[PDB]
Design a protein around this ligand. Structure first.
Ligand SMILES: CNc1nc(Cl)nc2c1ncn2Cc1ccccc1
Length: 162
């Protein structure tokens, strides 16, 4: 069913994550971590304190799809990842590491979200946006509800993290 999912998305904040390659998203799905540039890292830490759930919605550039969505379980932390680094990039830029809990690891093609526009990006289709773009509540909720159900995930523990 979808009731626990709707509860998790209740009053959540949503951010679009644009990865340059699939390898990093695969690594994030295996290890439950994400890293972004310093500008987006600061925005996500602020949002984590402000909302009962912060949702990251992933899209690999040129894939034409979203690859799933996850909930932040922590602010970024350093010390204690073999990211594939794009042109330029640098390991120090990706140094902050967030822990995340996947809510859906299934794909959604951009063709299925063409009816959703994001007020925080000039009402462009939600697939359009740079890495870190915030997605307004209603559009974010409807976008997440479009993904195929991921029956391998139990949201009971996620609800407890809240
Ligand atoms: C592990 N995190 C990441 N991995 C990859 Cl391959 N691309 C990312 C990324 N975070 C943001 N981008 C997009 C971008 C923005 C600016 C210059 C190069 C690439």
């Amino acid at each position: 069913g979808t009731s626990k999912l709707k509860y998790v998305l209740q009053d959540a904040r949503f951010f679009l994550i644009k990865s340059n390659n699939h390898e990093n998203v695969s690594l994030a799905k295996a290890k439950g971590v994400w890293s972004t540039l310093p500008v987006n890292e600061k925005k996500l830490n602020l949002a984590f304190r402000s909302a009962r759930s912060v949702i990251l919605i992933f899209s690999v550039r040129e894939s034409g799809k979203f690859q799933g969505f996850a909930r932040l379980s922590s602010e970024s932390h350093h010390g204690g990842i073999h990211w594939v680094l794009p042109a330029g990039m640098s390991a120090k830029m990706l140094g902050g590491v967030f822990k995340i809990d996947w809510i859906c690891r299934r794909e959604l093609p951009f063709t299925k979200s063409a009816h959703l526009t994001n007020p925080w990006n000039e009402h462009k289709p939600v697939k359009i946006g740079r890495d870190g773009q915030e997605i307004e509540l209603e559009c974010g909720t409807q976008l997440c509800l479009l993904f195929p159900p991921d029956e391998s995930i139990d949201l009971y523990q996620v609800i407890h993290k809240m």
